[PDB]
Design a protein around this ligand. Structure first.
Ligand SMILES: NC(=O)c1ccc[n+]([C@@H]2O[C@H](COP(=O)([O-])OP(=O)(O)OC[C@H]3O[C@@H](n4cnc5c(N)ncnc54)[C@H](OP(=O)(O)O)[C@@H]3O)[C@@H](O)[C@H]2O)c1
Ligand SMILES: NC(=O)c1ccc[n+]([C@@H]2O[C@H](COP(=O)([O-])OP(=O)(O)OC[C@H]3O[C@@H](n4cnc5c(N)ncnc54)[C@H](OP(=O)(O)O)[C@@H]3O)[C@@H](O)[C@H]2O)c1
Ligand SMILES: NC(=O)c1ccc[n+]([C@@H]2O[C@H](COP(=O)([O-])OP(=O)(O)OC[C@H]3O[C@@H](n4cnc5c(N)ncnc54)[C@H](OP(=O)(O)O)[C@@H]3O)[C@@H](O)[C@H]2O)c1
Ligand SMILES: NC(=O)c1ccc[n+]([C@@H]2O[C@H](COP(=O)([O-])OP(=O)(O)OC[C@H]3O[C@@H](n4cnc5c(N)ncnc54)[C@H](OP(=O)(O)O)[C@@H]3O)[C@@H](O)[C@H]2O)c1
Ligand SMILES: O=C(O)c1cccc(C(=O)O)n1
Ligand SMILES: O=C(O)c1cccc(C(=O)O)n1
Ligand SMILES: O=C(O)c1cccc(C(=O)O)n1
Ligand SMILES: O=C(O)c1cccc(C(=O)O)n1
Lengths: 265, 265, 265, 265
């Protein structure tokens, strides 16, 4: 009755928290991890992990899957491998929960068709923090009243992808309600290239990468003589662990790909 | 077919904008104003108002009402008179739209029973700005996920009432979903009296009064390793005029008191 | 003993405030304005301006200067003409105060050499609001402690130039103290072009253009487990008028170009 | 040549970080800790601390001091004991570095006279984070331009003292430059008691206590049509450890009490 869980990227900043979270969830067993550095046969061979953590380490996902057959694979690796990892899972009977960001629209859609076809649950979560999920949800609603919006998204300066998964997802959600259009004066000029940020269906997105930050976003809706702002700030990686636990549990109940936890609160 | 509108406090910071707004609404006639300073027979006798504004001035509301019989009275006066003004209207066949803040819970409830009994529309709007209304609406929803919240509310330093009407209304709305409780360590001490702010069913409220501000609020919901924030900023009094126009129109369609525009977007 | 002042762009959002400000300064006479639309011989012929404002209108700056010989020309026009306007002034004996933004580094330096050579005062003010000036000043100082910084700069959506004059000036000031370097992970990728903003000596700058905004900036300095933020918000164009008055006065006391009011508080 | 350091409150949220920081500073030896719970003879007997941490535990400060004679005592305990602890140190030849908040003005002044008289260094640091120190420093300067200011100060909801040490110190600093006065309309009324916050020489202070927060402050200076804001956010307790290390080092160089690290950057 335990959910048998494998994790990708156990030594990472998210990885190790999720290792501990899964170790201490009483309805979940951590049955394996995937790395890409030889760090021994068992995760207990690493420092940062105690001797009790006799979890087998694999350097090859296909090997992990065939040897261990986990119910769920939680990916917290890098954008470079996210698609390949998810795909391997989805055609070898493993439910992926993907924390990792940096799918393409096309790859996400391909993953969605694979889950559909194999009747297999998958969660792609751009943010595990419940306040972030709430932010996104309210963005959809606010977009109805305020068609002009921008997104500013801020993270630690080791983050590899800009804009962030959350900002992409926010913008998609907004884009469904908001009529497509450009903002700013039609004749504005950027005299320093990049100033006005990225653009998603006309919605500007700006990305901040500084030391000290963890994960933050604000959504600014302009109106008549006023500004409505939605904001979320995660101050540490523990803010994500309830979402991770919720996602492992939730993925078992579905037979298709769910993109974003907003759908299933 | 015109809505016949009288306004209380026409020379005030809100008053004069609403005078202009009502003058330029094509489905509304400004049929009278109420002051408490002798400023002449007609509002056109005041500077700030053009010669075209031949709107009769009254210093007595009962006189105004009996002489003019407006469909609607828009009050933008002071907390000192708000109750008396609303009550006079509600038992002389006039729909009040009350911008003015500073009713007591008891007075609001008395006003609500009078409207009910006289089958007469009344809107009490703690904020006319649509982003503010949206803020309040989302506060209710957010309160379900985050029971610990505080409100910080900021206005120009001529404002007479603290906390603000909006902050009261926000807190009421939150209080319906949020279990009643105290926040902060149970043994915390205030060593400078007032630090921890006012309290509404355990919800702290803090009020900022500075030059330069117009009207602003933020709502801070604490959670695990994170903070979810809802914010609205009105940068001028024109931000309120769509709400005022919406309220005059909406009041004509109802036969009871509506508290807050959230109900009727 | 009156400062004889001419203004460029009198009907503009800044222009008209500055018209009124200069009209009501008792040590200043508004002796002319420059437009580029035929709006009559006198500014009093325009609506928005009262009959008392018998200020001659010119459509040609050289004509204005030769006819009127103002002590000072206050430019609040457009980036397209700023350089040409300043230059005409600086070689016809007129002190320019330039509110208008959008000089190039090269044009600014050319203007600085012209003022030097003609012993003629000139102020180029990227922001007239004293809190903005203070923000910039503190940015220099903060940069010593926190080498990693980003600038987010927000304005109404009729603004023509991005990034803003203030953000350029902020970055220049920072750049003098901050060692030149790139921020963000060295391998970060922008998967939506523009996300990470413009770059000034490695300092990111992001520009927000929404309805309802007037002028706003924040400066974010990342550090160990923390973030230091400097912020300024102008909520209307009156926030600039003390700076404008200060600049007209100050320009008379100098014999070279001053870039930014920080130098001369 | 090592600084011999004892710490009060080693198991606390600050305490344990400072234990690790001091253990890993190569010019410092942790020679003792003070608790008030019997947790064994050595700190290594506690979990959270490794076997290598053979640091003697004392339950009595006087005993600690006479037995160990540390150069420096770092207090991270509770407001209840702060004064007593500092005083014991200052008349038994030990330099106190006091992280703990909640001295009275009178107790602080008494401590300052004791240090003076015994020619003994003491640092009372209301914030160890360098951005906080910078915030305070800039507050003094900003106060010259903007006499109307409020302070909002936000911390986790286990914090015992409100307002915070930092907010007290900020206000003191401001109060030296700012003319003493009340803010807000002179006739404003609080209809919910506490709304307008605490008052320090007329300066309002508001205190927020929520889960998820660590330590945060903003300082809001109102002006003409504008607002200047100084802000600092500590996102974890590691943000304080450079300040702690700096303070142990700095205290050795002084022969009197220094209140706030602003003096000695
Ligand atoms: N959804 C959310 O709520 C959320 C929250 C936080 C982060 N994230 C995302 O999650 C990902 C992880 O972030 P992070 O900050 O934890 O990054 P991180 O600290 O870089 O950790 C990534 C880990 O994956 C390892 N790794 C890299 N390639 C691998 C492979 N092919 N197989 C196995 N392991 C591999 C890395 O090892 P080496 O260091 O040895 O390369 C590292 O231990 C990012 O994409 C980020 O955007 C999402
Ligand atoms: N719901 C919202 O969205 C919203 C927005 C803004 C303001 N408000 C509220 O609306 C009220 C007005 O704010 P404000 O800033 O406009 O205040 P204001 O500028 O003080 O204007 C109040 C006006 O009412 C006049 N007045 C006072 N007592 C009166 C009486 N008995 N009869 C007739 N006129 C009277 C005043 O004249 P004297 O100056 O001669 O006394 C003044 O012209 C306040 O309660 C405020 O909280 C609500
Ligand atoms: N330093 C500061 O503190 C500060 C503050 C605010 C704004 N600004 C800057 O000041 C400039 C003005 O901003 P704004 O919002 O006032 O713009 P605006 O409302 O567009 O006004 C510009 C005015 O200049 C007129 N104009 C354009 N070309 C002209 C020419 N060749 N000769 C004479 N008049 C001309 C325009 O008339 P038409 O509309 O007929 O073209 C308009 O009336 C911008 O560059 C902005 O960045 C600076
Ligand atoms: N200056 C700064 O930068 C800064 C930063 C953070 C915190 N602080 C301040 O530092 C203090 C500590 O904060 P915190 O969050 O670490 O509090 P904490 O987690 O409550 O820790 C206090 C520690 O002191 C212990 N303690 C209580 N009374 C004691 C006594 N008489 N002798 C020895 N130990 C005692 C407590 O043990 P029990 O739990 O067993 O009672 C606890 O382990 C607070 O006053 C806070 O305001 C200052
Ligand atoms: O939206 C995202 O991409 C995201 C969300 C939380 C954390 C991180 C991260 O640490 O990179 N990234
Ligand atoms: O909530 C309120 O009480 C409120 C809302 C907008 C403006 C004002 C005001 O100007 O006083 N007050
Ligand atoms: O820094 C700037 O460029 C600036 C500053 C204030 C106002 C404006 C504007 O309204 O465009 N622009
Ligand atoms: O100013 C203060 O009192 C302060 C500063 C940092 C942290 C804390 C705390 O955690 O209580 N308190």
């Amino acid at each position: 009755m335990m959910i048998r869980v494998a994790i990708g990227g156990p030594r990472g900043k998210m990885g190790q928290e999720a290792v501990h979270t899964v170790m201490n969830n009483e309805n979940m067993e951590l049955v394996a991890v995937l790395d890409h550095k030889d760090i021994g046969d068992l995760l207990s061979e690493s420092p940062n992990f105690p001797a009790s953590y006799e979890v087998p380490v694999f350097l090859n996902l296909e090997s992990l899957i065939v040897t261990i057959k986990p119910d769920v694979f939680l990916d917290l690796t890098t954008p470079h491998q996210v698609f390949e990892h998810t795909m391997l899972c989805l055609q070898n009977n493993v439910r992926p929960v993907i924390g990792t960001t940096g799918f393409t629209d096309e790859q996400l859609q391909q993953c969605t068709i694979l889950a559909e076809v194999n009747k297999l649950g998958c969660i792609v979560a751009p943010n595990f923090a419940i306040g972030a999920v709430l932010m996104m949800k309210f963005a959809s609603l606010a977009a109805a009243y305020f068609p002009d919006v921008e997104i500013i998204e801020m993270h630690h300066d080791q983050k590899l992808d800009a804009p962030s998964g959350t900002a992409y997802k926010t913008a998609q959600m907004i884009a469904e309600v908001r009529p497509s259009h450009k903002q700013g004066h039609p004749n504005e000029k950027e005299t320093l290239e990049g100033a006005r940020g990225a653009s998603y269906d006309g919605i500007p997105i700006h990305s901040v990468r500084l030391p000290g930050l963890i994960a933050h976003q604000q959504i600014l809706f302009g109106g008549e003589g006023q500004l409505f702002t939605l904001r979320h700030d995660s101050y540490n990686r523990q803010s994500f662990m309830s979402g991770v636990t919720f996602s492992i549990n939730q993925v078992m109940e579905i037979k298709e790909l769910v993109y974003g936890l907003e759908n299933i609160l």
